[PDB]
Amino acid sequence: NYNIPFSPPDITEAEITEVVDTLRSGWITTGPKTKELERRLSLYTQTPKTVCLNSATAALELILRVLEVGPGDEVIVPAMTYTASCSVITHVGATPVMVDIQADTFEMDYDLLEQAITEKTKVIIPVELAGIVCDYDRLFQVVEKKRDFFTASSKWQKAFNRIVIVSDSAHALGSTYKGQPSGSIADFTSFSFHAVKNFTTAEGGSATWKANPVIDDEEMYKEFQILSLHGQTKDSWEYDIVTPAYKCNMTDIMASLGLVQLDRYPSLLQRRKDIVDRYDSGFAGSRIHPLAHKTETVESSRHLYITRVEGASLEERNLIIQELAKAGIASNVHYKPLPLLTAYKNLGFDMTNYPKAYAFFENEITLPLHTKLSDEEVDYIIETFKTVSEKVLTLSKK
Amino acid sequence: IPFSPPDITEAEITEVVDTLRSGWITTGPKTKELERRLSLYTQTPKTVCLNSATAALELILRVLEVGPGDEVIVPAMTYTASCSVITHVGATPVMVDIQADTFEMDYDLLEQAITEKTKVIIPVELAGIVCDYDRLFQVVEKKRDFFTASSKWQKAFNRIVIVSDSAHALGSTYKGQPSGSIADFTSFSFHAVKNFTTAEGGSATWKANPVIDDEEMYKEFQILSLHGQTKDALAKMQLGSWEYDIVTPAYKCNMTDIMASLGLVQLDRYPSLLQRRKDIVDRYDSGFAGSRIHPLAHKTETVESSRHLYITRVEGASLEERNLIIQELAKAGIASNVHYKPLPLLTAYKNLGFDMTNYPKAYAFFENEITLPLHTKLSDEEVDYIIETFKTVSEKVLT
C-alpha cells in the first residue's frame, strides 16, 4: 500500500562521504568547512557574510541580542507562526506584540501592523511561511512611515534609526521576492537547516544581513561569533571572555551536510516545483485551496504545501487529517495561532483578538512536500484528499 | 605534538553513516539508546543528552527555577561556562576562593559565602578529579536553616542543591561511585576536546532520590530542550499525531542521532581510552617525580580520575616565567595550555564587580600552572619527549 511520510530526510552517499571526510580530519566541531559553508551561503543569498549556527532559533535570538533588544522593547510577530519566531523575544526579555493576519493569506494585515507600532517597537519579524516571502515593499513603507515613533537605545539601533525588519526565513532558503533571494531583502534574516527543512544539516541554521552602508560586515560577523562561543576573544593560551555569552556554533559535521546539500539544492528546488505544479493542477476547481507558490512578486522555495479546505470546521478538518492517515498519508497543520498555546495564553494573549489567524488555522491542512515523494504518491494524495474531504462533508451534511 | 586532537576511528564513521541512511538524523532512537547506556554507566536512573554541557548546566538551573534574586556559588578557579549560565537565568554568581594545594573550593570559605538566597553550589571536577562530596553535603546540611524554597524542586530538596560540573569527569569515581551518581545533578561535556566526544554535546543527569519522579524530571528537561513542546496521550495514540501544545517558550538544545552515533561507539571504546590515559598519566607521574614539576594527583584515597587534563604547577615560577616556559615548550613542538585564568581576571566578570584580590589562592594556582597534552593519540615516545623537554625548559628559564 502507501505509507507516505510528511518530511523524511533526503540524504545521499555524497553527504555521507563529506561527513566521513570531516570525521577523519583534525576538525570535528567548528572548522574550515563551516567557514566555507558561510562563504557559499552568502553568495547564494547575495549577502556579504553569513554566520552558521546550530539552529534558526539560535540565529534569531542572536540577531535580537546583537540589536540589544531587551526589557521594555516591543517586537512584533504574526499571530500565525511557529512558536520559535516568538519565544526568542521572551528569551531576551522583550515584549512580544502579535498582529492578526489577512483573510486570504498568512501575511500580517499591514494596516493592523501600523496600528500595533509604538515608541517601544524595535523589530518586526515577518515569517516567510512555506517559502512564500512577505510584501517587503509594504513592510519597509510601514517602518519608514512610523520612523518618528522610533527612539534608538543601542549602537545598532542608532545605525538603522528605525524599526529593524528581521526575516524568519526558516522555510525560505532559496525563495525570491522581485527576483532577489531571501537573505537580501530584510535587514537581518534567519534560516533553518533542521532535519525537516528543504536544506538540512539535521540541526542547524544561519544568520545573515543585507548589505548596508551603516554595517561594517566584518565587525558584525565578529559580534555574532563572540556571542555564539562563550564571549571568548583573543588578540597562544591566552583569551578573554568579554560577556558571559552562549554556545551555539555549527560543527564541521553539520557544515559537511550543508556543503553537499547546497550543491544539490538547485535540483531539489526543481523537484519541489514539479510536485507543487502537479498538486496545483490536481486541486484546481476543487474545495482544496493551496497557498500560491508562484506569484507576480514571489518564487517560493516550496517548503510546505499549505492548503485550506473551503467550508470545513475545526472538527471536520481534524477528521480529514485522521482519514488521510488511515489512507497512508501523513499530514500536518501550520499552525495553531500562538494565542492557542498555553505559553502565550499564560502571557495574556487571547485568541479572540486574532480571528483571521484562527480562521486560517481552522481549515488548514499541510500535505507532504519533499523530494522523496514519487509522482504516483502525489497522484494518490491528490485523489485521496479530494475523496476524503467530500466524504467528511457529505457525512456532516447528513 | 597537539594538545587535544580527536580520536575518531572507522567505527564512529560507520555508525554515523548508518544514522545518515536512516529515517532519523536529528533526535531519534540512537539518542534514547545513548541516554540509556550512559545512565547505566553513571549509575543514575535517567540521562538527558543535549548539544553541550553548557546547555545541560543551564537546563538544570532552569528546572530548579533558579533566577533573579537567587545566589549560585561557583569556584573562582573554573571555566567561564560554569558561571555564565548563572547570569543566563538571571541569578547572582557568588565566587569562592580555592585551597592552597588543590583546585577545590576552600569549604570553610564556602560555608561563609552561603546566605538565605543561596540555591545551588556548582563544584567543578577539574581535570577529572572529583571534589570532596562528603564535605560539600555536610556544608549544605549544616546551613539548611538558611534555605527557603521558592519552586517545586527547591521545596523537594529543601536545602541547597549541589550540581556537579563534570565536563572533565565522565568515568571518574569518588569512593568507588561514578560521577553522575554523587551530586544532586550532574552535567557532562562531549565537546571535541573531551575524553568522550560527540564533537559537540553533553548531558544532564541526577542521582536517584526518592523525592524525584525520574520520568517526570526527564520529561521536564525534554520540554525545555525542544521549544516547550508537549503532546498528550490522545494526540500520541492517534494515527495522525500532529497536535501539540507549547507550555513555556523554551529552548533548542537537543542532541541529534548523528552526535549520538559518535557517542555510542565512544562509549564502547571508553574503558580502553580510559586505560590508555591512565598509562600516560603514570608515565608522566614517574617522569616528573622529584622535579619542580608538580602534577595534580589523578589517583587519591577517594578519587580515581578519568584523567582528562594533565594539570601541573611549576614550583617557584612567576607569572612571567610560566608564560616564557609555555613559549619555550611551543618552540620545542609541544602544545600546552592553562586551566585556568580565575574568573575575576576575565572582563565579563570584572564588569560584574568581581575582583582578583579577593581570591588569592585562585590566582596562585593559575600563576604557575601549565597543562601538558593528555589524549589518546600521544605515543609513549612523545610523552618521554614532553617529560624531558619540560624539565630542561623549566630549568633553563629559572637559571
Residue numbers in the entry:
A (entry chain B): 3 to 237, 246 to 408
B (entry chain A): 6 to 404
Publication text:
Spr1654 is involved in the early steps of TA precursor synthesis, where the first amino sugar UDP-AATGal is suggested to be synthesized by this aminotransferase, followed by several TA biosynthesis pathway steps. The three-dimensional structures revealed that Spr1654 has a fold characteristic of the type I aminotransferase family. Each Spr1654 subunit can be divided into an N-terminal arm (residues 1–14), a large PLP-binding domain comprising residues 15–276 and a smaller C-terminal domain comprising residues 277–404. Two dimers, composed of subunits AB and CD, are present in the asymmetric unit of all the obtained crystals of all forms of Spr1654, with a buried surface area of 2490 Å2 per monomer (15% of the total solvent accessible surface area).
The crystal structure of Spr1654 was determined in the apo-, PLP- and PMP-bound states at 1.9 Å, 2.2 Å and 2.4 Å resolutions, respectively. Consistent with the comparison between the apo- and ligand-bound forms of other SATs, nothing seems to happen with Spr1654 upon PLP/PMP dissociation. Indeed, the crystal structure of the apo-form of Spr1654 indicates that water molecules fill the cofactor-binding cavity, without any alteration of the conformation of any residue (data not shown). In all crystal structures, the electron density is well defined for residues Tyr4 to Thr404 within all the four subunits present in the asymmetric unit, except for a short helix comprising residues Ala238 to Leu244 that is missing due to flexibility in one subunit within each dimer (subunits B and D). This region of the protein could be part of the substrate-binding cleft, which explains its high mobility in the absence of substrate (see below).
